[model samples]
Target: SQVEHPAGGYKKLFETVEELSSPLTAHVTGRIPLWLTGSLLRCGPGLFEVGSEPFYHLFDGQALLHKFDFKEGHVTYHRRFIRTDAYVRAMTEKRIVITEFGTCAFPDVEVTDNALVNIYPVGEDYYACTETNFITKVNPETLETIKQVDLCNYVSVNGATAHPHIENDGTVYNIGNCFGKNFSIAYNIVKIPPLQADKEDPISKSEIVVQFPCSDRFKPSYVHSFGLTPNYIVFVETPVKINLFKFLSSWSLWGANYMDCFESNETMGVWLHIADKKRKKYINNKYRTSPFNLFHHINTYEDHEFLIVDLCCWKGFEFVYNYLYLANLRENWEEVKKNARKAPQPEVRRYVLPLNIDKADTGKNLVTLPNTTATAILCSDETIWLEPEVLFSGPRQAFEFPQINYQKYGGKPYTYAYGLGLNHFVPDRLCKLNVKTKETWVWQEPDSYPSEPIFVSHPDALEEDDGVVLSVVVSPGAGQKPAYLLILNAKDLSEVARAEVEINIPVTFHGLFKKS
Candidate 1:
């Protein structure tokens, strides 16, 4: 029910720009691998203000679809603003008729599912996703939105995370919140089967995989993403709670926006739940951890007898969303830096959970892994107290928006995670982290901001790092760098090549490289 913002040293990222619907050939500064052929599809917020009503945050605005087509060692770039109901309604009324996450113009109806943050694939098609349940389908080939699908008609959930786990077979799994028949709120995990030979729609076959009650019956914890292993589904419930009263009651004169309904619960700490997908039951043991708000899950995998849950987590209760306001972001660098400190720093943390509960003893470390600094101890209250091993952390620049070689190493043990380094809450560099060695390699240019690094593996690749990291680098107020598609060697973070789009545009949310 709340929204967050992203500030920028390069403030033009939030400004509205014209869509380059016509494909433009990118000037190649370096050579591209002929074997690498696919379209890099991305989505983000565009058109901040519509008809004098200004969108105030990063998550607010009309969605834009971008594509970088790679063919025969050449590239072409094209972008278009998605025509969601939110966009069309706002355009027709011309005064922010639909309330965005950041700006609430008039008293509006319930929240819509249109979000510009990510473009995800379902079955054979791509869908533009916001943080919530409403989804608009699109043809990635044309970048045109095809249809709007509401999960409410298909399932019993209201709000679902935009981040879903996709398998090679085109199966999709997502988690969302469900309100009880009487009062309380709970969560449900859904499984959308793959596209079939019989021409069945995957979403029509979507079924509830598991449903669990919330840590707080009245106020549910906010969740962006979760962890998954081969045998288990990991759910980490943090203290960032959303008030039902703020959502239900218009008594505050409906004085509302996405930010007003959420508050950080300092005392709740964190609740960890693991469901055995094989057994199809929740674990009997109660697991708890320290307070940290989780967003992006780095990776989750199980070892011989233990499970490792890695995450990109926020450390403090500062509520990181407020830092993204357009006013604060474009105000000034000095003011932004001072206000930015109030936002909690995120860490790439790893926590180990023991599967064997029978052998566990009270007040002693249960983690038997000889290599890890993380620990899980059985407490007197039968709560497993888990402490994480911080993999990466920094005050100046953060390692959020984590990306691993999911095509090969996801849900398995491996090294190397690529992430965007956010300096002053704005992306400025690309980083590659060796999880085993704690060593790092970074790629940065002066005043440059790149999107999340997505790893595409080379054919016949066996080793974990045998891949290339693809990112769209956007440099504002720079003549030479401008906006371009950057490809770096995943092993070393060295520049392999770049295709310059020859224009300045805001970097996007989640994207994927579609193998044609």
Candidate 2:
């Protein structure tokens, strides 16, 4: 009950900051690997205020792209404001011009395409992406805004998730909510082939691989991300429903935040929908679980007659965005602590789904994995009830924004997972958890907050953790060190080196290391 949080410790992390237009070399405290030659790209809301008006939500600010370039054992940092229509509109009109996820400022006959959350690769090029239809293409070398690419031109979907699955061959897989006949809602799995020798736009060849319809005609569940495996494309239809009627109606047309359109379908429980990635078909199984809301999928793998799905989940169908309001985040420690306690506490959950359903003992636990505590039991209604094993759970220790040795371990059995430890809703540290052994190693510094760690494998890797994890560590309270690019040994979570950039960099969402 006693939470003595110092006032304004991490407050500046969310504030508007001027972009460092040119590359500024960092003062390296330790050696950066000469073999590790790449730039770490990060995207987030860097400008919280525009003109005279302030953004109401953490996700409402204009997109700012930050890059840390590593070349021949040295590092240089650069940042630029992404010139999206939403950002341009706000700056030109001197006010908030469109309705954001939480800020309601109405619109200018178009939805806000603020690609402020993450930066993902499309073929050989990089795109600043949001949980919407638009992605801003940017030059990796200069952090320059290249162009805007809309996904709707290729795929018949309203928007795609920020997290996408990229194959070794550069093939990309993404999911988005789309409307069907009679305005029925469905999620379409879109695929973009890798670049060809002909040099055509890969997105031009994008196709809907499979379509999974929502059981609800007018309401579609909010899916920030989904799971991908070698054989299956996993989609969890949660009980958190988005009321499209409210979204499409004039009520929202005038001025209504996207948060105002969320409705929890208490009775409809969460359902698991799997699609055969090879066949490009749906495997509609009656896999049901109790109502809960999830933001990120840690990893999914097929093992011994089952598909193990791991996700960062909270207990109810209620939207967690309400607690993320800027006003709530700016409150005093006492009020913040009291309000945060009621906020849905997050935990890493491991659910095992039986792949073989040809036979099942009624009411018997079907999980064959001897090491895991997770179970899937046959129900009387022929639906399987999944009970997850608690990997890690906490009051102030929520493990989210998960990452792995994705190039090597994604869609398969893996040992290590790196994530942001959102202690008390603030991403204050980096976490490395062993999903197999439940062993966790953490890297935390007082009065500092770090973004999600991007794991870079050693050029000649042997073990899973034989690499370094990169994160944008921000110390909002420290003037001597406002921000730095932190390099930690992924094997043990030890600080390898740090490149201190005295500029104040806002905390970013998700990013990747583009190897040269």
Candidate 3:
């Protein structure tokens, strides 16, 4: 069992903020420490504890920038209803956009803060969801409601993504329960007109052109994150259940019993819906089984295959019974099919097994290998989950399932098995397999457990040799908090640098790395 602190054990922020200004090296500093610090700053006695709240922070390699702080009251939780989910986006080169999951104050400070889920720029403007289900845009800088847009008329906006698209117009897209469907999640794309300086009152409008659920299994339990790509709007969905009525009905259950567990389903998988911006339709591709949170990475060698990496379980329990799975979406299917039938799943599937059997483990124990890196994928220890119809019926949609190969060729196909285990010390690694030769390279941290690994590009190289892998390593000790960022050489997993955070951030579900 984990040690408990007097301050409610731990607190996780819906969002944690960090700034990355350093080019070669970065630092992790923020108001979180200030909260823990004594009577230096003018905030009330900081009652926050590390390793609990889902606070956000950033490290860009040169200088460390602490993004947001609820302790500082920069976050106005007093007037809000519910403690809502929050999002952070770097608007201009200087401005940052933050959206929160907010609600109206049912009564007290705790109830009010948890009631309102809202969005706002770091210090500029704020926007929140109203009982009318409209997004009321407020100028945090000026403390005024500029305008309100009917987000409900558009697909229900849960998660949002913003970046400069073309002609300086920032493109924004949101994902949540869309199409007026129950227990379904979808996406809505909008073009946020750039903020104009001359206009005294800016008319805010959002057009919901494309709104469709990703899959039948999607439950709005939590769909609060999105990834933007040229081909499609990429995001992750884990089956969840949220009731605003139950949330507002009582104060004791404030944000504590919010996430109600539903019956677990194995068919549930993370999906990538490739939207044809011109046609207004999406191409669906199954990524993984019950991935709670996902981080995206792209490489050029194989026609820009996105690495859908996640921590899954073999037993499918809540108590950390899982390992890591790396899906390389660049392999040829015909070859995968030819080999999957001949491959065998890993042994000791007890702690580490393919995600197909059962999905377990949480997000804190996994990370991406930074830099462009490559490893060989073996033909053995591979388990391909063919659609029930494909194996029983015909060769239809069977190619969509990933083929596993642990045994090398001519070595008794389907003769080997490999398993993985959750690492409290380091984030597990991605294995490169060579189907033809039966060889595998483990691309991971050197003898350390990694919590989250974010892959980053080198200054100019195009190949894996020219890139680096950035990750956070947790060193579990007698009386220590195991959370720190560790940079490693992507190709060989060599040591780069390590930055220790004073607070003990238990392992988080997901994290992102950005360079500007």
Candidate 4:
């Protein structure tokens, strides 16, 4: 049966907003937990259209910040647009002048500042990040823009991943790919010191920990996120290639766009690079696996002799094109669903790599296996090993934007991962997967969509899944239906509380929960 509504009812979610001055009190529907005292900060594209022309891609919209303040047992909501230089100039000029991630610049005007993907805390300050190299510092309390810091000062790169993993000891790690004039690709690892280092000396701030060059035959792959274990950092280079010529000429070309510059090359396959955390050096070994597109990595840990990496994977780059423009999404929902089903659907997959592999081996360390299986083993002289396998997969069902009890489970084998579950191309459910038992717990309501689930640990949580999962549930009908903050019991996926907001919020990609 075809759904007769606009694409996920996204029109109202894209409605433009100037600001929200005072906190809007949400109507509490159930009892909020007394121990859940923290601020949930979310960032997304708030305005999709400017003046009479609409943005060419969904990611090009201006950055919007939403804050949910939790104190005692009450929650207050506040939202505002990040007043970047371009945003301020465009608002005053009453038109679009900025060249964003996917959107090109206007005829004669050229502007750049748009950090709309993620909000992360670095040291004592918070920052907004896009795919670009610079991060805009924001006031965590006021939700206002402070300044943009160019990471090139510390790590020389054009851009970096928005999803950086923060360690329990407060070390922040992220990866970025820089292209040289001769088409050489350098993957740089950025490491930022803890809050104490920012206080100690300027020389101990963020810096490039390591740089690894990719094979000359392959171009710089599109990497949205990476993985980190206790001893190593994992970077997977997919087969998606960017046409640098078109990307550089988009400003002058009549119809050139960023999304159009990407193409999937199945022959190149996927490359896995590992770097030693302590040594801050790239292990000379390179591992090549089957071709797959990845957006976010779930979590990784080290077993006896293997590095276990769990991530969400797609077969190709079709999903990227499906999100180009809102009109295309609204009118081509059926095609999107068809492509999603016919293509290799997104699923949670676990990959095991031998940690003892020769780090000095310059040969291509490749592994071949069947695509549909859950396990593969490599046997050597008295050694038995397991290959990458699909943990969860099915028709019309997929997983993305995964989060776990990062404090306790990060870099360790633990259970319970919360993520967005998609039925076809629509995100209509929240999923909690038990890695050990292979059992899944899901919460879904008809026509209601959920954002990325953020796991908040309890004060004295004894078990890994002892806390709660929080998500913003957006109902259909745009502004006609109010969105609610859903808090569920992390153990069984049971509803613990929900606070209704009078306004409808767009689907957000990522968020952070700052414990009070």
Which prediction has the highest TM-score against the true structure?
2
Which regions of candidate 3 are displaced past 4 Å? Answer: 1-172, 179-209, 214-229, 233-256, 265-274, 282-421, 424-449, 476-484, 499-516
User: What would the per-residue lDDT of candidate 2 be over residues 136-191, giving only the tens digit for each residue?
Assistant: 88898888888888887778888888998988888999899885522546998989
Give the whole-model CA lDDT for all candidates, comma-separated: 0.80, 0.85, 0.29, 0.74
- lDDT tens per residue, model 3, 79-178: 1111122111122222212211221112221211111222423113334432223454543322233554544454445434311122113334444444
Give candidate 1 regions above 4 Å deviation: 1-9, 181-184, 251-253
Off by over 4 Å in 2: 1-4, 106-109, 181-184, 251-254
Error of 2 at 301 (Å): 0.7
On residues 1-516, what C-alpha lDDT tens digit does candidate 1 reach at each position?
211123333676667878875899999878798878899988888788887678888788788898999998899998888888888888787767666677776743567555687877877778888876688898888787788888877877877887888876777878887766324368788788889888777888888788766887778878788877778888888888877777566633775876787889888788888888767677767788888778889899999899888888888765677787877767656676778776787788988988887544789999889999999989888899999988987775788889998977888897889998877776778999888887899998765678999999888788888889999887666356567889998888999898987777775878889986
Q: Give residue 368's error in model 3 in angstroms.
A: 30
TM-score of each: 0.95, 0.97, 0.42, 0.89
Model 4 worst lDDT window (10 residues)? 362-371
Ranking by lDDT, best first? 2, 1, 4, 3
Candidate 4 residue-wise lDDT, 44-107, digit = tens: 8888877886776668888888898888889888888888876887788888776765676666
The true-versus-predicted C-alpha distance at residue 167 of model 2, in Å, is 1.1
Q: Is candidate 1 or candidate 3 better by TM-score?
A: 1
